[PDB]
A paper describes a structure:
To further study conservative transcriptional mechanisms, we imaged DLPs at non-transcribing state with the same methods. Thus, the RdRps in these DLPs existed mainly in a duplex-open state (DOS) compared to TES. In DOS, the cap-binding site of the N-terminal domain in RdRp interacts with the conserved terminal m7G(5′)ppp(5′)GGC residues of the genomic (+) strand in all segments of the rotavirus genome. Compared with other resolved reovirus RdRp structures, the rotavirus RdRp’ N-terminal domain possesses an additional subdomain that has a helix-loop-helix structural feature (residues 31–69, HLH subdomain) near the cap-binding site. In DOS, the (−)RNA weakly interacts with an ssRNA-binding β-sheet subdomain (residues 400–419) in the fingers (residues 333–488, 524–595) of the core, which can bind ssRNA both specifically and nonspecifically. In DOS, however, the C-HB subdomain retracts from CSP-A1 and narrows the transcript exit channel, such that CSP-A1 returns to a similar conformation as the ones found in CSP-A3–5. However, the corresponding amphipathic helix in CSP-A4 attaches to the C-HB of RdRp in DOS and detaches from RdRp in TES. A unique C-terminal plug (residues 1072–1088) inserts into the template exit channel in DOS, but moves away in TES to allow (−)RNA to exit.
Here, we report the in situ near-atomic resolution structures of RdRp before and during transcription in rotavirus double layered particles (DLP). The RdRp has a conserved hand-shaped core domain (residues 333–778), which is sandwiched between an N-terminal domain (residues 1–332) and a C-terminal domain (residues 779–1088). This core domain can further be divided into the fingers, palm, and thumb subdomains, with the active site located between the fingers and palm. An atomic model was built based on this high-resolution in situ structure, with distinct side chain densities and RNA features. We determined that the RdRp is attached to CSP decamers at a specific, off-centered location, as previously described.
Author numbering:
A (entry chain I): 248 to 690
B (entry chain K): 61 to 99
C (entry chain H): 346 to 641
D (entry chain G): 642 to 690
E (entry chain G): 445 to 543
């Protein structure tokens, strides 16, 4: 089409024509938009109806990783950006169906414990806080905290020997660098001084706070049984493994946790603590800790099937993220009651639940919409922080263009962020390169 | 109340009615020990 | 047709859906109907006379709508369906019924592959009855031929004879004797009796495809326009729930097109094809005559 | 031109325990393929010859 | 639980019943004879007067089967076992005396 344009005007209008943000669309490029760990999965069957012509185009978003490093010295901004992912990852993880009914389980838990109506004993409080609603809640805050890397915090009472035995299942499956250290040590010390050091007869440890070693790292050196020193070594050396899959760095679990073979290393350890005599303890202490170790040891078939279910719903939902997941201890820790862990291990049975594909394409479309909005508000602000230094505007102050960058990101609040965290955030936005569609329109 | 789960309290069985009575005469014994110390 | 209240009441007894662990208990037998068997007899012919692509709609939970998808692939040629819905049906048949039967691993399939999944498991399987049915369904297409002036896509001689279903019966009877070596005993015994609801219907399923390939053959004679075959943009959705309503509701009552019907489908096709060539000759004769007279 | 559904339907109905409304036409034409291969009784064969 | 060994890891769909897989693990003699009789308890198909009808064994007819079972319940009531508490031992040992 002909024109009449000024030679300055034609240089601008030619640049809008050559540099268009459209790319051709096919059938082989819709299926490549789905992540590779879902269209290679054998549980989901993928089907489509129409085939698009050679004309049709689409605009590709830019999913490149974090260039500001908000997990590095920005410790109050990272807490809002990782609480936001934790509420989103909690409304996606599925809820359990076809549980063992609560009435038929406490009737079986009351006959194994053999609780008497006249003597007051410590086998009454094994029955507290189990129901079908808190069993559904421990399953969510274990998967949703792992995908968002929120720090957890255990909460329990030390006069309950069932939240301590079923607390030996959290530490052997969930990695130990995830619970906060003031609450990881105070739970490992309650297992040591109650379950295992009275079981072999040695003197209980006098542990002062501030030691460099957790009480599971100092007890495997002191103990001399073999099959309880293999479990006590797996708990210490349990870590995530940082691998880069499909561009995004995500933290996979161990190869024994995915199989469920960890529980067969645990049910040889506490199958031996119920075989030892308790020499320095009275007879009513051997019996009230061997009954609570039996309610977990009759669920060996159901706990290998439970470890294989947390490790699978964490694998499928990890393919639906796009932002890089980093491992940094956050300020505010999201609580986890240790009584609801006990309510999960002895209420689940014989019903696999996997996340439906209509919520994998919705958990993916939110993680792309936030990531392609976060990466296109960087380039809108780097290209003005740099353009107000090339033009030599020495009287301008750059608070009003970082204040509109925190605001246009929808998840932040401005009445909380002070001025110190805004003139230092623009110390990072100055070193970044300008995106190549904004640089030639400034030159 | 007892603060056990609600499907055990409103249930009408024999193995679940005894469990409410045993947890009711453990409270009356735990309050009997705490009262004798206070005198 | 067979009475729809006597078939479903018998079909619900052989499957035993209540004793299993199945979420959709009252949803396996929703599409069996007398008004939905006539739809998949008309959709399957009229999307074959006019070369129209045809997607599939199914639920991979419901295995009975998947066994009746084995009969659809062995009769209707493979280039008729859109590829993304032919692969998604061929993968769900293998990864649920065939490979759990012989005890093999689940088929890891990548979507950017030139080989359809019925071409990969045609070599990695070690039976002969099943590996010979997979060879026919890989190699049935339309064989182009020019009859009396026009090109027309014609079926092969083995489907019009109805003899292929005598091979599918032998590939489906031996798959019913296989012990599913990891499947639970309750779910295995119901997928072996859902197969024997189609292997025991041999005599009235050979008698279907002799009629389904004769109504298409005697309606293709009155096609004046050319029967070219490309992939369209929009597809007529065929539901595999209602193909189940055809394979086990047909009877011994053959219907042929009436001669007054067969002479009316001819006279519509000649009147449209002669009108298509009398507008081309009138739009060329003006475009050319405007250029000779120098009409800018 | 005769079809043999009406004389297998009368064969199930003449026995007392079976019902007709639950037996489809699959299971009634498959039954006469086992009634053809059987030899006819010697009293009925000599009165048909 | 009566012999103290670890409870079996059984998944559904296995080709062997748990009595066909526990006679290989248990090395007692009077209770591995009873599991071998249960696994080989079948009907014997004979024809008599033209009619094929199925006969039981000659030990189920005699009643000598129970003298193999009550030799296995009596020894299993005497085995003490360490992995279970004392009252779970005493409740199995009481219900085995009513038989």
């Amino acid at each position: 089409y002909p024109s009449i344009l000024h030679p300055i005007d034609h240089a601008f209008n030619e640049y809008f024509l050559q540099h268009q943000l459209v790319e051709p669309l096919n059938n082989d490029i819709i299926f490549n938009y789905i992540p590779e760990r879902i269209r290679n999965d054998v549980n989901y069957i993928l089907n489509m109806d129409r085939n698009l012509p050679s004309t049709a185009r689409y605009i590709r978003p830019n999913l490149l990783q974090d260039r500001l490093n908000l997990h590095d010295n920005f410790e109050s901004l990272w807490d809002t950006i990782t609480t936001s992912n934790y509420i989103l990852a909690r409304s996606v993880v599925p809820d359990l169906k076809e549980l063992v009914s609560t009435e038929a389980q406490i009737q079986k838990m009351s006959q194994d414990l053999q609780l008497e109506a006249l003597t007051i004993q410590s086998e009454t409080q094994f029955l507290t806080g189990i129901n079908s609603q808190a069993a559904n809640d421990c399953f969510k805050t274990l998967i949703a905290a792992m995908l968002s890397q929120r720090t957890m915090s255990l909460d329990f009472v030390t006069t309950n020997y069932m939240s301590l035995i079923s607390g030996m299942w959290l530490l052997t499956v969930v990695p130990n660098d995830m619970f906060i250290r003031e609450s990881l040590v105070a739970c490992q010390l309650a297992i040591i001084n109650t379950i295992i050091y009275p079981a072999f007869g040695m003197q209980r440890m006098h542990y002062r706070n501030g030691d460099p070693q957790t009480p599971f790292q100092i007890a495997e050196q002191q103990i001399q049984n073999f099959q309880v020193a293999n479990w006590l070594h797996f708990v210490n050396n349990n870590q995530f493994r940082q691998v880069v899959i499909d561009g995004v760095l995500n933290q996979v679990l161990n190869d024994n946790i995915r199989n469920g073979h960890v529980v067969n290393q645990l049910m040889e350890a506490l199958m031996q603590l119920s075989r030892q005599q308790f020499p320095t303890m009275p007879v009513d202490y051997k019996r009230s800790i061997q009954r609570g170790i039996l309610l977990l040891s009759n669920r060996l078939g159901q706990l290998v099937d439970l470890t294989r279910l947390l490790a699978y719903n964490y694998e499928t939902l990890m393919a639906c993220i796009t932002m890089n997941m980093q491992h940094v201890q956050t300020l505010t820790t999201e609580k986890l009651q240790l009584t609801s862990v006990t309510s999960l291990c002895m209420l689940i049975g014989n019903a696999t639940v996997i996340p439906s594909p209509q919520t994998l394409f919705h958990y993916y479309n939110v993680n792309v919409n936030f990531h392609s909005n976060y990466n296109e508000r960087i380039n809108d602000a780097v290209a003005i922080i740099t353009a107000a230094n090339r033009l030599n505007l020495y009287q301008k102050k750059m608070k009003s263009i970082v204040e509109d960058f925190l605001k246009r990101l929808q998840i932040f609040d401005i009445s909380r962020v002070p001025d110190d965290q805004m003139y230092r955030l623009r110390d990072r936005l100055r070193l970044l390169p300008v995106e190549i569609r904004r640089l030639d329109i400034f030159n | 109340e007892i603060k056990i789960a609600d499907e055990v309290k409103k249930s009408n069985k024999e193995e679940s009615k005894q469990l409410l009575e045993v947890l009711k005469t453990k409270e009356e014994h735990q309050k009997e020990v705490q009262y004798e110390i206070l005198q």
